[PDB]
DNA sequence: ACAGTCCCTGTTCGGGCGCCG
DNA sequence: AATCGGCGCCCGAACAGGGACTGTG
């Protein structure tokens, strides 16, 4: 089999990246998996003379013991050329199973003047010895050149499977493929492990997990049921009686929700307030004011209109911790034209972890933004970057990163929870 | 001993590059015929060899005196030729530490004779490390080397040389996976578990494996008792501590002189506790002149008396104990300044520390509080590969109180309360709600762009009024200082409305100091407040006092 | 829309300490 | 001091980046 030439996009370099510090846990689990990797001709050690490196850590495979490793080759797929429809029904279906297939790329040789690139290292506890260097000799995982020149091969592999489940969408992104059906859950579970026997004729699938059942809080990114996402509509207070601090929140809540909605009006409640009078002062809605209210009421009930997605613009996906282990996130492309609005809420940590929370809130927003669009968000995370970087590998279970940046936040998004 | 058989690393020069043409400069007659002895010699072993006017290059060569040794170490100012090498991925990623060490039977350390001069260089790369010995007699032209092995002073010595180095330790490492070797440059710490006798027996075994390999480990270098010298500590059988630290006494400081105060002082703190560096770090603001005289202050003086105070005495570390818990425990000492002690049995410390960096212009204690478990949690993953069990000084109501208020997400590993005053605590807190019977301030400022004067004031329900002017001031400025009156103007509880999020956005967060001035006015009014209740409005849409403000302080 | 100013964060570099060649 | 290389840490500061506010018709 012949390498399929690859080339960097014009005017850049390789990655260069650092390796970050990695527990015993994680690194012994590296070297038993790398070590492994380089008999069977996958890998194979380098020296400094390689300029590259793209960091590397290991994940605890979904409702399992197994280690994968996961390559954070964020930095090689912007810097790598682009190769050459999204299936809308997906999101559509009962159930749809995720299927870690990477496995399958380390069958297909990369192209020699291509394999610096994907250079990394493995760090060693208390720096006992110098980190030693590995590159890749066939498509990695977590490459976004790997798909594509696996593409054709995944065609072959699935057309038999396909006509033969003519009612079933298979969707892929990177190493996963996305199984949609809409079966009953326990004979979708069936045409699942139906599909994995079909694989395993060409090529291995993760082993299987502890569970044939699906166990409380352990299938979150494996087993989703996408026709049970709801959106977040954004809700106004309903009080008998209202005070000046009360109408204050309300016309600053409706005049920001009036850059989302244009019909949002606050004319006849800001008249409620034209005095100069005390917080805590009750002040009785007039008529004008009430049919006001009431039909921002109405407003902001009906979806939006005019709102498309853009396959060229990047998504963006911003997080309110809004607390009670309650998250509030707007996926969009343009300020204020969001694409949907969620809210996610009971993750793990149960009413103690914070990051861990939010490690998980973005791994479901990308999975939801991967199966509604194909694409993934840049996220703008509210947590510090110190305290992100710590803690986020140890709560991660996906196969893909996506980009994110950090900022902080004023509390004055009270306005979506 | 002959240059040693491992093969060269492939080394280029970066794309559209030449090697280096630098003139060599005059040297003294003493380090010239220290060279040229240095020279005839490394000739003889092959490390270098002649070269003729074929060779375009050079570079300027000296000679400084070994670290601590009657040799000269030959080294050249490759800095040009670095300029052009190709790029390198280094390979050493930290710095063994001591108090990552487990207890062994036996422990030997050696250390690499020349180590760079027994790695051969590529041979493609060697017509470019040319360089030129001066003779005495001005007439004579002088002989002109080329290096054979890794040169002194090139960017890729350290990278491939510690490279090297481990492919000549595999094949023992892999025959013998029972046996601990430290790898760092060319010295080894050996730990094993088996007896003196066929520890000895092992350790001989090593030295002919790197024998063969070129690698020399001369007796002179070679260590079999405690104390172990390595790294800059002494390693004693049972506990680790850093070599001598020497503290300059003087009568008047420079610029320099605080810098190698504070570095000193940073590195005895890994295991002296208390060490502060705050005061005198403080000098270093502003003043770029290297050789200018600084008068210590009150406070610097004060702070390195105490750190004289903790020096005199020694101190000693422990080593690493993989069945038992890693336990980390946290103490304000000043103001921005945290010490910590990693350990694992009470009063018996592996190592310890300091974290006292300002992050931002506003912060609290329980963010520095955190920001110093995530700084102990990193370093903990480097030494010992997990995360320690934490004791901090602060309650578990205080820390729940404010991850749930926090609009970030915070989280603190599993930690215990250790009641070791001071206590970190939360100086105020805004109230949820309005409070009712509480005077309403209704406050704002503007300012000019050019002219950078503002005004700052209030409206109240009770009809009271307030416009300052300021000066040299800014819009930010200004809706701070407009909450500042209102503070100032009113009793123990009382509702402030104002337009501005930065300003709400730094008092939500309930800082306790700021590197602003005003801000620290601020807080010390808060804390002296018994109910402040903070709320924002959109400025410009005919709300309440804030028009009737927006407009006295817009005229 | 578009361009500034203000303020804040994060990155990099200057000095220092330490290891070693 | 002139006069080198690689790594880690600290602390101080220059530079860049981004978001909010404000001023223009």
């Not at chain 1, 166990?215 to 106004?236: A, R, S």
């Not at chain 1, 279970?397 to 950090?406: L, R």
Request: hydrophobic share 35%.
């Amino acid at each position: 089999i012949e390498t399929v030439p690859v080339k960097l996009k014009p005017g850049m370099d390789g990655p260069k990246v650092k390796q970050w510090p990695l527990t015993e846990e994680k690194i012994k689990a590296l070297v038993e998996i790398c070590t492994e990797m380089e008999k069977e001709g996958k890998i194979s050690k380098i020296g400094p003379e390689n300029p590259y490196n793209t960091p590397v850590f290991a994940i605890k495979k979904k409702d399992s013991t197994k280690w994968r490793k996961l390559v954070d080759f964020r930095e090689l797929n912007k810097r790598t050329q682009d190769f050459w429809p999204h299936p809308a029904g997906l999101k559509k279906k009962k159930s749809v199973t995720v299927l870690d297939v990477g496995d399958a790329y380390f069958s297909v040789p990369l192209d020699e003047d291509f394999r610096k690139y994907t250079a990394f290292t493995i760090p060693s506890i208390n720096n006992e010895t110098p980190g030693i260097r590995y590159q890749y000799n066939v498509l990695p995982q977590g490459w976004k050149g790997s798909p594509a020149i696996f593409q054709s091969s995944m065609t072959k592999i699935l057309e038999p499977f396909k006509k033969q489940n003519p009612d079933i969408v298979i969707y892929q992104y990177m190493d996963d493929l996305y199984v949609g059906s809409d079966l009953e859950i326990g004979q979708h579970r069936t045409k699942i492990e139906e599909l994995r026997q079909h694989l395993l004729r060409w090529g291995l699938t993760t082993p299987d997990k502890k569970h044939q059942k699906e166990p409380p809080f352990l299938w979150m990114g494996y087993e989703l049921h996408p026709d049970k996402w709801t959106v977040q509509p954004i809700v106004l207070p309903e009080k008998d009686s209202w005070t000046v601090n009360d109408i204050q929140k309300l016309v600053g809540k409706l005049n920001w929700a009036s850059q989302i909605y244009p019909g949002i009006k606050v004319r006849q409640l800001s008249k409620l307030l034209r005095g100069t009078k005390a917080l805590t002062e009750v002040i009785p809605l007039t008529e004008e004011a009430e049919l006001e209210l009431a039909e921002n009421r109405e407003i902001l009930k009906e979806p939006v209109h005019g709102v498309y997605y853009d396959p060229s613009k990047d998504l963006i996906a911003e997080i309110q911790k809004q607390g009670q282990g309650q998250w509030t996130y707007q996926i969009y492309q343009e300020p204020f034209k969001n694409l949907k609005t969620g809210k996610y809420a009971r993750m793990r940590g149960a009413h103690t972890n914070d990051v861990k929370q939010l490690t998980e809130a973005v791994q479901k927003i990308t999975t939801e933004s991967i199966v509604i669009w194909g694409k993934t968000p840049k996220f703008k995370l509210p947590i510090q970057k110190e305290t992100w970087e710590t803690w986020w590998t140890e709560y991660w279970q996906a196969t893909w990163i996506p980009e994110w940046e950090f900022v902080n936040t004023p509390p004055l998004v009270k306005l979506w929870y | 001993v002959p240059i040693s058989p491992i093969e060269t690393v492939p080394v280029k020069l970066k794309p559209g590059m030449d090697g280096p043409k630098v003139k060599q400069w005059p040297l003294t007659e003493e380090k010239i015929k220290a060279l040229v002895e240095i020279c005839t010699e490394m000739e003889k072993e092959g490390k270098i060899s002649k070269i003729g006017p074929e060779n375009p290059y050079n570079t300027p060569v000296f000679a400084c005196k070994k670290k601590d040794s009657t040799k000269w170490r030959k080294l050249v100012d490759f800095r040009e030729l670095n300029k052009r090498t190709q790029d390198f991925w280094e390979v050493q990623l930290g710095i063994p530490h001591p108090a990552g060490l487990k207890k062994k039977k036996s422990v030997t350390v050696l250390d690499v004779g020349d180590a760079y001069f027994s790695v051969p260089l590529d041979e493609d790369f060697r017509k470019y490390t040319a360089f030129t010995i001066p003779s005495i007699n001005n007439e004579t032209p002088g002989i002109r080397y080329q290096y054979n092995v890794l040169p002194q002073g090139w960017k890729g010595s350290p990278a491939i040389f510690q490279s090297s180095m481990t492919k000549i330790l595999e094949p023992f490492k892999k025959q013998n996976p029972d046996i601990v070797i430290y790898q760092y440059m060319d010295d080894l710490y050996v730990g094993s578990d088996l007896e003196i006798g066929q520890h000895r027996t092992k350790i001989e075994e090593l030295r002919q494996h790197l024998l063969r390999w070129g690698l020399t480990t001369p007796d002179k270098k070679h260590q079999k008792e405690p104390p172990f010298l390595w790294m800059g500590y002494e390693l004693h059988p049972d506990k680790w501590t850093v070599q001598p630290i020497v503290l300059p006494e003087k009568d008047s400081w420079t610029v320099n002189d605080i810098q190698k105060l504070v570095g000193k002082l940073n590195w005895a703190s890994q295991i002296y506790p208390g060490i502060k560096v705050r005061q005198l770090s403080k000098l270093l603001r502003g003043t770029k002149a290297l050789t200018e005289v600084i008068p210590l202050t009150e406070e610097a003086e004060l702070e390195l008396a105490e750190n004289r105070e903790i020096l005199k005495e020694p101190v000693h570390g422990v080593y690493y104990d993989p069945s038992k818990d890693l336990i980390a425990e946290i103490q304000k000492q000043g103001q921005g300044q945290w010490t910590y002690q990693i350990y694992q049995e009470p009063f018996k410390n592996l190592k310890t520390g300091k974290y006292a960096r300002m992050r931002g212009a506003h912060t609290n204690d329980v963010k520095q509080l955190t920001e110093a478990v995530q700084k102990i949690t990193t370093e903990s993953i480097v030494i010992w590969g997990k995360t320690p069990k934490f004791k901090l000084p602060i309650q578990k109501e205080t820390w729940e109180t404010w991850w749930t208020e926090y609009w970030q997400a915070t989280w603190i590993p599993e930690w215990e309360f250790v009641n070791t005053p001071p206590l970190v605590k939360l100086w105020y807190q805004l109230e949820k709600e309005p409070i009712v019977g509480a005077e309403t301030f209704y406050v704002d400022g503007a300012a000019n762009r050019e002219t950078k004067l503002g005004k700052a004031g209030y409206v109240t329900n009770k009809g009271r009024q307030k416009v300052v002017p300021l000066t040299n001031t800014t819009n930010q400025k200004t809706e701070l200082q407009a909450i500042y009156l209102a503070l100032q103007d009113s009793g123990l509880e009382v509702n402030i409305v104002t337009d501005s999020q930065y300003a709400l956005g730094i008092i939500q967060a309930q800082p306790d100091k700021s590197e602003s001035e005003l801000v620290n006015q601020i807080i010390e009014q808060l804390i002296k407040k018994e109910k402040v209740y903070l709320a924002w409005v959109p400025a410009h849409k005919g709300i309440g006092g804030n028009e009737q403000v927006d407009k006295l302080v817009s005229a």
